[model samples]
Target: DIPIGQKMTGKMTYYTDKGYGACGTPIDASSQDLVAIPAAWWTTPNPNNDPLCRGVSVEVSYNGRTIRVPVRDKCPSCDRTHIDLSQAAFAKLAPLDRGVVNGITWKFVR
Candidate 1:
């Protein structure tokens, strides 16, 4: 598994529908500080064992703001360098209407 602080940069988008995630959990922004990483990283045959899943949290930086969000889902249409933040999570970094956040950086955390 990638160690903490191994930084990655990508774009972020928000989702509100809170679809059932590949991790087999219901994505709930109203409660959890949830985020959806790209599908490209969902490599394990069993979703629970995916390196990027299993309680992995990410600290994301955008526009000089930072927030730590947990991974609860996978972005099926997202590219390798893209992530999907929940409505609740995205609100902390940028205005809702912005829709997509650019040039954000992030890393794993314990």
Candidate 2:
């Protein structure tokens, strides 16, 4: 389980303006409430448990800006501490034109 209120440092990347997410969820890139987490962060799949991280909400903070977004996709190529956010969600924490943010802080909210 993700520890609530325990901020973790990671990197952020933006994704294409697609309308579909990896977890079978529909997303709107024009909205700032979507994010993708790495597979390792998806509760570490185990023999008896195959949990999905989809729908998990996280509060992300960067450069003094913060936004809450739901985990609707999976970043298969991302590192364990990396996140891939939608364009709108990335804009809330940094300029969308920046493309990538090297260091970011986030935590589970629920």
Candidate 3:
């Protein structure tokens, strides 16, 4: 099972203009929001609300600075290993992208 702070890289299904917030803002990323894991990455209680079951914590990097975020939402469209991050989360991983980031590497934290 993936442990907390495990590095992960993949495309993001940006969640902008989705009525989630008044405007895009970086926020926490969660495993449950992920469309899929590496199969081996899957631990127990695979619920979007419980990313810590596998010792994973939320992590993101913005402008080369890393930040810890909490899991907030789930993405139904990201059903192919794709992970959707909030506008805030996107900024942390890929500041160049305004809305949705194509890909990023995130980790879990305690």
Candidate 4:
């Protein structure tokens, strides 16, 4: 069973938080601490009742770097192992020109 600190690895991509988000939060790309998990894990169709959309946060690690970001959205097109990171959060891990980064590992955080 998955527990705290259980890590999942996949690609991490950058995204701009412009409009309303699935989690119903005020999303800001400049928030610098926001991330979107895979929609496959969203569970309930209602964003409000989704398990991960609640008090859950995520800890992402890549290239020896680690970051903790709020789970404020869902990556509808991303694979189960992939995650969409806010531009600012992705920048902390790698350059935007990279467009996509792999070997990314993350876990659910309360």
Steric overlap count per candidate? 0, 0, 11, 0
Model 4 TM-score on a 0 to 1 scale: 0.90
Q: lDDT by residue for model 3 over 5-48, one digit each (tens)?
A: 56776555455433331112233333113222333344345443
Candidate whose TM-score is highest? 4
lDDT of 2 by residue, 1-110 (tens): 66677888999998865666666656776765687777766654441132444345778999888889877777879997788888888877888878889889888776
| Cα deviation of 59, candidate 4, in Å | 0.7
* Per-residue alpha-carbon lDDT of candidate 1 for residues 31-54, written as tens digits (9 for 90 to 100): 557888887777898876787777
lDDT of each: 0.82, 0.75, 0.46, 0.84
* Candidate 4 C-alpha lDDT tens digits along 35-72: 88887787786886777777788899999999998888
Best first by TM-score, ranked = 4, 1, 2, 3
Q: Which segments of candidate 3 are over 4 A away from where they belong?
A: 16-56, 79-81, 92-97
Best by lDDT: 4
RMSD of every prediction: 1.8, 3.3, 7.2, 1.7
Worst 10 residues of 1 by lDDT: 24-33
Runs of candidate 1 with Cα error greater than 4 angstroms are: 1-3
Candidate 2: residue 96 Cα off by (Å): 1.8
